[PDB]
Write a protein that binds this ligand. Sequence first.
Ligand SMILES: [Os+3]
Ligand SMILES: [Os+3]
Lengths: 109, 114
Amino acid sequence: MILKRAYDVTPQKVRGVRKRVLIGLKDAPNFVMRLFTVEPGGLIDRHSHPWEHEIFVLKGKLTVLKEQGEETVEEGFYIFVEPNEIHGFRNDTDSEVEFLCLIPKEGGE
Amino acid sequence: MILKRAYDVTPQKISTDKVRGVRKRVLIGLKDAPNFVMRLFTVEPGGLIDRHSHPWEHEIFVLKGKLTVLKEQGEETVEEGFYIFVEPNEIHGFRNDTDSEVEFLCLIPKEGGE
Ligand SMILES: [Os+3]
Ligand SMILES: [Os+3]
């Protein structure tokens, strides 16, 4: 069993974005747990990949970029992104945003 | 795409010979997810998920409070902002020794169900 404070993990199309792989394929067989910290004004550009995302918003107000248009979510929201669905993320606030993001092994890390 | 408040998922009361004082939400389940499932557990004060094992892993992130983790031997407490990886077939359990509700995200591969 691994028990650890997330922030202590060294971080690894994006601006103003810290990506931590908390549980990677180093340890886990099937899927990966990442922690993303988006500074004010940070951006993950719209993209699409042939694997899903499962996300939980931990802190702040997150702009979710969609195929057309956008939606704002906040702490305590989850997000499912189907494989190949267009998605991006932006921090349109004065405050840090943080979310958990999990992908299956085919997405690598 | 699904974008929803986790608390809006109706929690199920979990009550077994090994679980007391626990509620569970399936946030992202097999209806949508091809590979793994996102659950949110709420442990009431004094609640217990006793030691057990299953042939799939857990990936956990603690959302709120102080979680007592029951290990193969002994116990360790973690808090909000900790993650936990439990290997397949590793003994593990959880207890809430505090006077407020504890919450954690818990993800399992689809072979574990929901
Ligand atoms: Os993506
Ligand atoms: Os378990």
